[PDB]
Amino acid sequence: TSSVLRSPMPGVVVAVSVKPGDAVAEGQEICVIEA
Amino acid sequence: TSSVLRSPMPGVVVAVSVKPGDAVAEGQEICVIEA
Fold this sequence. Notes:
Distance between the termini of chain A: 31 Å
Helix content of chain A: under 10%
Number of helices of chain A: 0
Subcellular location (chains A, B): Mitochondrion matrix
Oligomer: homodimer
Structural class of chain A: mainly beta
Subunit structure (chains A, B): The holoenzyme is a dodecamer composed of 6 PCCA/alpha subunits and 6 PCCB/beta subunits. Interacts (via the biotin carboxylation domain) with SIRT4. Interacts with SIRT3 and SIRT5.
Number of strands of chain A: 4
Order of helices and strands of chain A: EEEE
Strand content of chain A: over 45%
Protein name (chains A, B): Propionyl-CoA carboxylase alpha chain, mitochondrial
């Protein structure tokens, strides 16, 4: 019933586009990480 | 140089574990989405 998203790399989070309670669509941006 | 993480499914974000400026390790939890 649930998905846990993890970072694919070491880096720094530069943007986060969602907060708890927001809906998401498949393919919708969650965050951006710089290497 | 950068990674864009997207939702793998339609759902609702139930938890977000990072904010801009935080470091992440490979495999570190970003968020949890419920279907």
